[PDB]
Symmetry: D2
Subunit: 142 residues, 4 copies
């Protein structure tokens, strides 16, 4: 069993990103999302699955999906931004298992990732615990 505990840091009081969706991919006996002491906790039944969090800033028409999981017994992450209305977390989470551009991100098994949207706002995931069954990450909204 794996857990990834995520601390969300929203660093800029221009716009406001709120949580809107949390998904579990179906491999590795699935998984769950829990809120624990102000943190998001993704629990997974084995290696080879993932879960996604979508955040939306309605004030500024910005959004992103942050995905966390374990691939071949190593943690991975990705961020997708500049979303169309059709790119829910349900959509994006599932794309990591069959869409080549997404598969490759997962296969990279990254301990950290940062991306900017069209407006220049940066978003980052940084794992603070990178090994073992109980992983930890900061999700940083610039």
């Amino acid at each position: 069993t794996y857990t990834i505990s995520i601390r969300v840091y929203q660093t800029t009081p221009k716009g406001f990103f709120r949580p809107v969706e949390r998904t579990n991919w179906k491999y590795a006996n699935g998984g769950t999302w829990d809120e624990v002491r102000g943190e998001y906790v993704l629990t997974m039944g084995g290696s080879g699955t993932s879960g996604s969090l979508r955040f939306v800033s309605s004030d500024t028409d910005e959004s992103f999906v942050a995905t966390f999981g374990v691939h071949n017994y190593k943690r991975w992450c990705d961020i997708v931004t500049n979303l169309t209305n059709e790119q829910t977390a349900l959509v994006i989470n599932q794309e990591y298992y069959g869409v080549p551009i997404r598969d490759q991100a997962r296969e990279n098994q990254l301990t950290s990732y940062n991306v900017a949207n069209a407006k220049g706002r940066r978003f980052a995931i940084e794992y603070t615990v990178t090994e073992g069954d109980n992983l930890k990450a900061n999700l940083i909204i610039g």
Copy 2:
């Protein structure tokens, strides 16, 4: 724009179901989940989409996915229980747009629905506001 505001009632102190997942289908400009004044609020960009909530009772190894949406300008709902580990809300939400028996449930445009798991516990959805753009439902756990 539709909202469906959901109040959860857990009616017996036998087992404890906790929220674990909330998904948005991609049709009709997608949608979001918000927590508002103790209720789960599904917001959708128009008619023809839906969102799902999964709840798990780890104490009693029970779970269910409740789905809410609007089909041809009328609200609908369904519950799936007896879930396999591969049946996350991500999976179940999508099945209402391709799987005949699930398609049929959506097409039923029900204001209320119930189903029991193999353990004999019943779950129900009851829309208390069945018309207009701000719909309301009780999710009742037996």
Copy 3:
């Protein structure tokens, strides 16, 4: 250090009680409230303090404060209902340390308590773990 983990069971879809306030009394090095896996977790720095949760049903003009704590190394609980607008949880929590009718409830060190409001709705606290540092209780709204 003591914890009391509380599972809220809202059993009747007549009215809707939502969480509106959570307080910590100042004795025994204070305490905190956390949300953990859908449960409310009161953590206290020693014996002799408590914390309160207030719930309000705006639909039906009903409300109550449920207080949990440890007195002389034994758990206690109380429920106050039929609240005036001036009886916030901040008010009620503090009354257990100087108001005789409230002091006596605390001194009773109850493992369970049930009360009805003027409308006849029952509210109950039942501790499911009654000894040790990590206590557990159901809060049942009738």
Copy 4:
């Protein structure tokens, strides 16, 4: 009826502040705290009361209480940090109605305020909507 809607910004991945307490003062028919679309919403029955939020970073042994209210029909705010274990939000909220220095902070009717703890970290409140019945503020953690 006033609402004050609060957005929390945690600006540095150094430490992690989590919500631990939310209180309502008893004047002006009291008030409530709700979570709405990722924001903390304080609702008050009129002018002359307030509510407090406490946040704790156990990682770095830091904490603060942020208080928001309306005094003589104008919004006010304060932050207290360098908290003792006996300074819960329950305690601090009440001090604004009897303790001269706290009374004075309320009487200041500030649209913005900041204070630093002994560790050099600054906290701020910034009202983004300063007039009317639906007030809005940023709570910024430095």
